[PDB]
Design a protein around this ligand. Structure first.
Ligand code: VO4
Ligand code: MG
Length: 299
């Protein structure tokens, strides 16, 4: 409720840029010394996007434990996320080692491999059932089991095997197809339909490790996805939409990874998505089918 009154006041005053710049100014600044070591240069996709030392995910190998990935641990909401960059050709084994070690069940990919003429993420999962991937460095095998291709997103079932122990795990891949970099999703409905598909899969259960969320840099689209989810969860535990302070939640998330939400329009969209999602949280179950129909996911 209060977020909705704030939304209309910011909209009618045309001050989303100023509100967003305020968040940038107030955001935490913590050291990223490991990310900046010379030996880790080729493990970072972008020179200006690094994990903080205090929240970085450490790989369980004595050689080099570095991956560009951050644990966003939302204490009040009681949910954690791992936000990471799109893996590079040389860090795909590290990525799946992280998924294994952290016991994640879901990977949310919000970008395409090719965007705007450039390669934004390595092809880190197999595209054909009969062409499985072996990651020699980390001793992992990855097989495509099936995929469900909808109009704007795809859900894949993957099998991840630890070749040292022969244990296997099902990993769900939720792949958003039409959310461009530095933009907001096309509609709250299509975004919320996707978010609730991730939720319904069980991938966010506290019984599993944290869901892995990435785009190319792991901060813009990834931050928008996690901000909306966390705000809806906070509202859900209290059953009180007016108790959620979305800018405070975003500043809390930014204690764990720099730069989350990259444009003023992504911040504005986050308000829109949380305000709409609140209808479901507060007991209008029918609204979820409305999002699905407006999503045209079968067209
Ligand atoms: O590739 V993302 O720019 O949305 O951090
Ligand atoms: Mg507010």
């Amino acid at each position: 409720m209060e977020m909705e009154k704030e939304f209309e006041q910011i909209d009618k005053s045309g001050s989303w840029a100023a509100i967003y710049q305020d968040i940038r100014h107030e955001a935490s600044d913590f050291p990223c010394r490991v990310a900046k070591l010379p030996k880790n240069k080729n493990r970072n996709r972008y020179r200006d996007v690094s994990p903080f030392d205090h929240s970085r995910i450490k790989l369980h190998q004595e050689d080099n434990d570095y991956i560009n990935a951050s644990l966003i641990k939302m204490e009040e909401a009681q949910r954690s996320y791992i936000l990471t960059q799109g893996p590079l050709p040389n860090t795909c084994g590290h990525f799946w080692e992280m998924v294994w070690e952290q016991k994640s069940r879901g990977v949310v990919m919000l970008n395409r491999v090719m965007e705007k003429g450039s390669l934004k993420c390595a092809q880190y999962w197999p595209q054909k059932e009969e062409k499985e991937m072996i990651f020699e460095d980390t001793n992992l095998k990855l097989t495509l089991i099936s995929e469900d291709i909808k109009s704007y997103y795809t859900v894949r079932q993957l099998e991840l095997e630890n070749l040292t122990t022969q244990e296997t795990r099902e990993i769900l891949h939720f792949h958003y197809g039409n959310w461009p970099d530095q933009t907001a999703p096309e509609s709250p409905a299509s975004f919320l339909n996707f978010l609730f598909k991730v939720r319904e899969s069980g991938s966010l259960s506290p019984e599993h490790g944290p869901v892995v969320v990435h785009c190319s840099a792991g901060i813009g689209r990834s931050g928008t996805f996690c901000l909306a989810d966390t705000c809806l969860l906070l509202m859900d535990k209290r059953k009180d939409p007016s108790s959620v302070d979305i800018k405070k939640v975003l500043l809390e998330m930014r204690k764990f990874r720099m730069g989350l939400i990259q444009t003023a329009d992504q911040l504005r969209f986050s308000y829109l998505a949380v305000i709409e999602g609140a209808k479901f949280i507060m007991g209008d179950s029918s609204v979820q089918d409305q999002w699905k129909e407006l999503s045209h996911e079968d067209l």
